[model samples]
Target: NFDAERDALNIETAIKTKGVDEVTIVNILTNRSNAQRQDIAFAYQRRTKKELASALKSALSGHLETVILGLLKTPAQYDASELKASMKGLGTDEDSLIEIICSRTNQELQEINRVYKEMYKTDLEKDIISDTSGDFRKLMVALAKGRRAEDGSVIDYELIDQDARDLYDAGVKRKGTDVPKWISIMTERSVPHLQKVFDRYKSYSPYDMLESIRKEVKGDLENAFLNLVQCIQNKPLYFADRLYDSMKGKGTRDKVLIRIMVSRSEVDMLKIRSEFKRKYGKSLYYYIQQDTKGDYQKALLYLCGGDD
Candidate 1:
């Protein structure tokens, strides 16, 4: 919102103000826009000859540090990091892979691939290949390649009908699903048309798109497919569910919280916030306020923008 250099100066002073000024650091970074934060990062690097993210790492610690560092990441970097983290260590987090891979648009997914390679020194596809297997891996690897049809205004009602029927034939019309057909249609069809196709789908098939998916696919494949459709159907609600899950029950999924809050803040956070309230009869902001503590809480609330 203000001058980048001045913000940089304040942050530098805060960093050196006998060390680790969490309040001022949180205040300035949280209040500014992402682009402004990037600008501040550049200015901070120029002024202090230290990367802003690295500097924050040294100054801040634990969950609080992650939130600040997350705030500084570009959407692609944040996403790439999430994808990498999901597959690293003890076991592959299939849910995380499905969440990120299925939710992103083709363009964003492409950037995620680029950033993953650049940031991690590994091809995202290669990593997925080595980490995952079977139909779930095949579906995700295909998606991670990111070749979905473009979303646009032009629609072919005839093609929509064709798609709907094709899906029916591939799925419910027969005993076993033509998995390739489902994959092709999901990967190829434009999103707007897909919704129309899914709506028309119920007319031809005995079940809705979601129900049909569950009936046909099983396990991780089912999850990936269901998530893809859910995302295609109502992106905000999908994210809202993810956010609620993050803060729900006994403990917090801080990684999910940080990624979703940071990633969606500039996009559809307002709608996601509203959907969170609508679905749960509670505000996301309220949940976060009660669930988290200290600078971590403050930073997320700021990213949340506001309560529903």
Candidate 2:
């Protein structure tokens, strides 16, 4: 109802001088970007003597407070807060990672690196190293490495295919006797590094990684191995196929449909959306709206950028 830029300044002033209410805080946060929020904060400080953080608290309640406050700082600071939340209390919030890792750019990762180190005097890489163990940690750290190169192109298709075949032979076909070793090479070595190697693995192997496994391996072991390999090779491809199979034939794959939509909501959901359309002939958001029903479906529908 108001000019975002002009009203942004007005809201910032209101937040500082008049003290914020839940309505104003939510108004500022509702559709604002980090830069937009920060601009208002800058205006607030320039116009008043109070800190934006303190004013934000007076204006909002509950988790919204933390979220709005989190947006007030540098991206690195924001990321550190996210990492802290993931590891704090309960067992471990592995699910929160989908957003943190997939959504952040490489430049953002560099900032996160510095901020995490400053906060804990330990690097994000090393912190992840200590907190998580085995394949899980390996995957986490690999993601933390940020994006792979394009023009500089560090990935190798030839060797990757060979090792993938080796992994298949040593682990899946052999019933996982050498599975630990495969996990070490794949996760510990990092996904981008393995992507290069997988390029090589596919070339050397008699079949595609999934096809090779389906042909040779059987049972839950086959499923497990496929999960690990797909996670390493192309996560989007893995997820896209998952959504496709769920929405195919008899009925919807409710579990896969729900999990992917919810978990990947704020991440590279657009990327997943494109992949789903390519693989399944429909956008996942649209598909879910048509195939599912009730509040469960509604929540996912809204998450995937659906209409009410």
Candidate 3:
């Protein structure tokens, strides 16, 4: 509701002022949606001949700076940035690759691919193939292809049962894991079908499909399959688990924390927060408060909307 130019000016004043008005910066950035922030960024550049993100980077420090910059990006742009970061340097961030690829729908992944090529001038699939290997590589490439079946398609109970048996035969009924069958069914089938297959899978294995995956697969491949299954079954709960995993233990996984929070804030963050409280017996808001500090904590809380 505020004028973009005026908001840009306010941000400029906040950043330019002695010691920087952290409160003003937070209020202006956090109160506005991503759309408004983009406008402010444009106006800030047009008015001052300087990039808003650059200005924020120079002015702020630590986690606060990372959060602010993350908020500035559009969802696709942010996803692209995260993908690039994961593949950068000597080693690949296989966990990030798995989390992002498995959790996103075909459409979301397609958009991310478009933005990624626009930003990086490289095919996301090529990068994935180069950075990863083995069964995990095949899974990532399939996901990057953005070929998951569309939602609202005809449900095939017969196919679901067949796939369930296939999954069982591929993983448990045999000595070796049928990686191709796992990939083909997972990557090709609709989510509804997959959910049914998971249900039918219980009859085939004494253990649940999740338990089977854990027992059968190992390393990055295990995480990839587990992520795909969890997302198909309960996306919000999957993210809830991710947020918990990110924040738990000796120190915070700051990148994962920022990625999940910023990426889902406008999507199903409320649902994730609810699942977090349900599963963990404590609110995500409470944990963020305990784990993080200063404006970073405040910004994350704002994105979180409200405590569960």
Candidate 4:
């Protein structure tokens, strides 16, 4: 109760002071949950006649700003911003777009679209159309529609087997990949149904379904199919692999790093971290510490929770 005003004043003083005390900034912001921080933002604006997000934006630079501002937005706002950013520049960030739209639940994406239009005054689907092309574009638009069937109470084994055979015929047995059939099933089936389909798919194809997609398809469409399959099979492991790829090389993909960490923090980060350790033989905590530096490091590590 008292802390909101105190934090507002402390943050005001910290920002107003010479050189900006990043330690206080990080300590206050990171310690509070997003809901708590939203309250602080309201109290801060009431007291200081400034938005906390705008103030922080003006003060911080680079990755630190990204993480802190990321924390500031409600999750839908953040997703909208990320989607907008992915398409705003010279070229489309196809992978980021696919990762978000593919991994999120239908409700989550529906909310993202709502927020996206409210924030940018542009339809997300329109943006998708202008920024991308071909089957990849079709996949993204369909995903943005958020039409996945929600009923999973029943497990239809016979239908699953039929889907598996249809998938094989569409890809391996056919002359070329049937993009329409692939998209239709991938987008329309219930998640539980899709999992059963992927399982039975292995028996029909000589190679894994993902491998078949790789062999049969090309370009961003290939990546989209593989991403969709992985997400369907195991979402946490899909993200763990995405996080590892973001950090593996000489330069880190700080956006991917922050996006997955921030997005998954509340949902399934614990499982993602466990999968990371299982898959990579290192803790996500350790990886963040090694790959990043400064308050950015502390912020990510904090979001990472404790070391595994």
Candidate 5:
């Protein structure tokens, strides 16, 4: 639609020719679909000779700015950049890296890896190796391989039982936990396979799959593995917990809030909203309304799309 020129002019006027129109800023960006945004963005740069995100950042500040810029990237671009940001600075944002790496599908991870390398000129797993160490590092590298076996039409019962047997032997039967065995088995097998493996694991070991992780590992390794298993069980529920954690106690982790809200808005914000209300006894909209203010709240709730 060449009518893109109209919104492009509107945004320029809103940003420059008058007062910073926070209201219309939210409206124009939200009203457009993701595909529309690309044209609008190109149109703006064509007319204004400035990138939308850079232009706005010079004029605006606050969490709303975060959401607005978040709306700029393609989904995979956002995750790749987030992973880059997580690894930079004095300390790592390990929590975010776990959430992104552990919850993504095999295909999604491959896309993220490609975008990551293309954007940063470095390997994601290689960065992980340098940034982290110990069992946590091992699991992170294994998952970053983006090589999880996909669920197929026919299941391999023999392989499933063998994985279960290996998990049991690696954790409970051994004098010391075999961390490598756990990493390889957990990361390589498909979820359906792991589901059956957990079932069979119960037949041989005293503890269940999640319980075995708890009994065997601790710290970041424990968190990474637990996130991996929980995501396998229910990814939406895992994200619901992340949303709650971001907004719940003390000060807000706006980065986490913004990341999930922006990325999942098109993907599964609705399902995540249902899970949030069911598990926490409140609507996702209600939480956003409570935790944020003004343009930021408006943008987030708009992305949320609805209440429970």
Candidate 6:
């Protein structure tokens, strides 16, 4: 609501007084895409007496500014750091994949392209190709595509079916690990590919893809595999089923609660909210808010589409 012109002038004046070089500050400002840098430069020119960097240092904490700089530089680099943090420990972090991929935009997708390319000297798409596969891969590609079609009607079932079946065969029936090939199939293929594949799998297999994974594999590896598949098939449906399982009996599935909050935060959790309402005719957000409290509850509620 502040005046952009006034703010820009103030900021330009401030930066000059700080003895901050316009070139250095502008270079920092120019880290983002041309359009973004121009907008920031414009906003800076309208602000206070401090240089844009100095004004930022004064108005925001150093760490926050650092984060903004990091993000402004490139989204893939930012997300790679974030994803690494989420997956660093002695556990499989399926949620990190979901949270990042689902929340990102097409522009951000390109930024991810830039950042991951910088980090790995290879395509972020290729990196994702190395990290995941199957229905999960299909889902990621669709998200990366950012098709903007909310109805999920654009997925190609036939190709996805072959890919999914091929993936299943590779894991359970093949001679050795083919993680790269798996990644290629999942991340490289389009949304339509996985959509078709998932439909085909549902038609051909007697049990759900997730159930098949569970029945075929064993151990923590199995859990990760099945989780990725089910979540890929339909994130909302997967979470809705999780919520039902969580609240089905005398007590809650505490782990499931943690899983939902940890995994779905910053995701299309709203989609899950919608599916939960559709499935159970109750508000997922309301239920969580009423049933849970404090950080755990607060986190879950935040991830859900809160009314307040």
Model 6 clash tally, residue pairs: 26
**How high is the CA lDDT of each candidate model?**
0.90, 0.60, 0.90, 0.90, 0.86, 0.54
lDDT by residue for model 5 over 1-308, one digit each (tens)? 44678888888888874669888888888666676777888888999889877887876689988888878888888889889898997678888989888988888889988988999999898898889998899898889878998889898989888988999999889887999998888899888888788898999998888898888888888889899988887778888999999999887899999999888887888789989999999998998889998988999889988777
- Expressed as tens digits, the lDDT of each residue in 160-246 for candidate 1 is 999999999998989888888888888788889899999999889889999999999898899999999989999999999988888
Model 6 ranges off by over 4 Å = 1-81, 87-109, 116-168, 171-184, 218-224, 236-270, 279-284, 287-308
Candidate 1 Cα lDDT to native = 0.90
lDDT of 2 at 225: 50
Model 6 residue 2 CA deviation (Å) reads: 8.2
Model 1 residue 84 distance off true place after TM-score fit, in angstroms: 1.2
Candidate 4 residues 1-308, lDDT tens each?
44787888889888988998888998888777777888889999998788999999999999999998998898899999999998987798889888988998899988998999999999999999999998889998998898899967888989899999989889999898898888988999999998889889999889888899998998889988899989998999999999898888888999999998888888898999999999999999999988999989998888898898
- Candidates sorted by TM-score, best first: 3, 4, 1, 5, 2, 6
Of candidate 4, the 10-residue stretch with the lowest lDDT total is: 1-10
Q: Deviation in angstroms for 52 in model 4?
A: 0.5
- Candidate 2 per-residue lDDT, tens place, 50-166, comes to 767776667655444544566566567767777777676656655445445543556777788888889978878876776676555655676577644433355555555666667
Question: Over all chains combined, what TM-score does candidate 3 have?
Answer: 0.97
lDDT of 2 at 266: 55
Error of 1 at 175 (Å): 2.3
Those runs of model 4 whose alpha carbons end farther than 4 Å from true positions after fitting are 1-3
**Clashes, model 2:** 17
Q: Select the stronger candidate by TM-score from 1 and 5.
A: 1
**Model 3: per-residue lDDT, tens digit, 1-308?**
57999999999999989999988998889878899899999999998899999999999999889889998998888888888899998789988888899888888898999999999998888888889889999989998888888876678878988999999999988897999999999999888888889999998899888899998899999989999899999999999998998888878999899889888988898899989999999999998988898888998898888887
Candidate achieving higher lDDT, 4 or 6: 4
**Model 1: C-alpha RMSD to truth?**
1.5
Residue pairs whose backbone atoms clash in candidate 3: none
TM-score of 2: 0.58
The C-alpha stretches of model 3 lying farther than 4 A from their native spots are: none
